[PDB]
């Protein structure tokens, strides 16, 4: 249908991190590249979102808010997809010029977090997620985290989230036969989406601390990345902004 054409048509393309693979691996270089990749990946997310159906309805402030709160969850989820479709979850495919292997996962000083990411990446396979399901879930991640005191126009956001959830159902109801698996498939995806939040929160904490002592470890932080991680992120780790789980 129309909805599906849009999502597949506004799906961001390949994005390099600009990492110089000629130089030996070093924490500084690796994380600095990831930050640069983040800044780059953020530009596409902004445009990707503005081109999203009904997104232009939210108040301009809520448009930037939701983007500054779930950018981590979106990029991680998408990255997990590339890893599955490119290297079959064997490694973390952040970018064509920035693939993480067992070694780099250790050199990045965040091996545990990578494990969970390589785990999310494998879920796409264990559950046999389809392209249509992936695209629909990613968009729903954009509307998966908001401040406890709601947004400027919560009503509009709830209906916007409600409608995207409906699209997921239709996508799911376009290949099933009996309800035994139908209403069941919904349970699987809803779980997968929720498993993303925990991972995202761990990375949030990590980038935060890394930013605090960025000068001592010589890790560069792009302008935008620096403002969001110091102004937006803190609100999440403080409890002001909490994700939206389907299950408890
Ligand atoms: C979102 C990015 C970059 C885009 C992506 O593919 C997922 C990946 C997950 C780890 C993030 C990284 C951006 C830079 C961060 C936030 C580092 O500071 C620490 C964790 C890194
Ligand atoms: O377009 C609006 O008026 C709208 C308003 C609030 C929430 C969602 C909205 N539209 C919307 C929301 C999800 C999916 C689709 C569609 F699939 F039709 F494109 C349209």
Curated annotation (Swiss-Prot):
Changing residue 221 to L: In prostate cancer and AIS. The record marks 50 as: Interaction with coactivator LXXL and FXXFY motifs. Changing residue 89 to P: In prostate cancer. Changing residue 47 to E: In prostate cancer. Changing residue 93 to C: In PAIS and prostate cancer; partial loss of androgen binding. Changing residue 227 to K/R: Loss of transcription activation in the presence of androgen. Changing residue 225 to T: In AIS; low androgen binding and transactivation. Changing residue 13 to A: Found in prostate cancer. Changing residue 240 to R: In prostate cancer. Changing residue 128 to E: In PAIS, AIS and prostate cancer; reduced transcription activation. Changing residue 176 to G: In prostate cancer. Residues 1-248 are annotated as: Interaction with LPXN. Changing residue 137 to R: In AIS; loss of transactivation. The record marks 227 as: Interaction with coactivator FXXLF and FXXFY motifs. Ubiquitinated. Deubiquitinated by USP26. 'Lys-6' and 'Lys-27'-linked polyubiquitination by RNF6 modulates AR transcriptional activity and specificity. Changing residue 25 to N: In AIS; almost complete loss of androgen binding and transcription activation. Changing residue 164 to C: In AIS; loss of androgen binding. 17beta-hydroxy-5alpha-androstan-3-one binds at residues 35, 82, 207. Changing residue 220 to N: In prostate cancer. Belongs to the nuclear hormone receptor family. NR3 subfamily. It is linked to Androgen insensitivity syndrome: An X-linked recessive form of pseudohermaphroditism due end-organ resistance to androgen. Affected males have female external genitalia, female breast development, blind vagina, absent uterus and female adnexa, and abdominal or inguinal testes, despite a normal 46,XY karyotype. Spinal and bulbar muscular atrophy X-linked 1: An X-linked recessive form of spinal muscular atrophy. Spinal muscular atrophy refers to a group of neuromuscular disorders characterized by degeneration of the anterior horn cells of the spinal cord, leading to symmetrical muscle weakness and atrophy. SMAX1 occurs only in men. Age at onset is usually in the third to fifth decade of life, but earlier involvement has been reported. It is characterized by slowly progressive limb and bulbar muscle weakness with fasciculations, muscle atrophy, and gynecomastia. This is Androgen receptor. It comes from Homo sapiens. The gene is AR.
């Amino acid at each position: 249908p129309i909805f599906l054409n849009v999502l597949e048509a506004i799906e961001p393309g390949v994005v390099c991190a600009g990492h110089d693979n000629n130089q030996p691996d070093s924490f500084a270089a690796l994380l600095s590249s990831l930050n640069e990749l983040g800044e780059r990946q953020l530009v596409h997310v902004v445009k990707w979102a503005k081109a999203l159906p009904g997104f232009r309805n939210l108040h301009v402030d809520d448009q930037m808010a939701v983007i500054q709160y779930s950018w981590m969850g979106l990029m991680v989820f998408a990255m997990g997809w590339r890893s599955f479709t490119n290297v079959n979850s064997r490694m973390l495919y952040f970018a064509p010029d920035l693939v993480f292997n067992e070694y780099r996962m250790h050199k990045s000083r965040m091996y545990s977090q990578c494990v969970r990411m390589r785990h999310l990446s494998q879920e796409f396979g264990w559950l046999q997620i389809t392209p249509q399901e992936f695209l629909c879930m990613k968009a729903l991640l954009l509307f998966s985290i908001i401040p406890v005191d709601g947004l400027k126009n919560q009503k509009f956001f709830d209906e916007l989230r409600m409608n995207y959830i409906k699209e997921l159902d239709r996508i799911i109801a376009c290949k099933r036969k009996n309800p035994t698996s139908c209403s069941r498939r919904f349970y699987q995806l809803t779980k997968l989406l929720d498993s993303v939040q925990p991972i995202a929160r761990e990375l949030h904490q990590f980038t935060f601390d890394l930013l605090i002592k960025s000068h001592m470890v010589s890790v560069d932080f792009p302008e935008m990345m620096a403002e969001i991680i110091s102004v937006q992120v803190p609100k999440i780790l403080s409890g002001k902004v909490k994700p939206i789980y389907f299950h408890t």
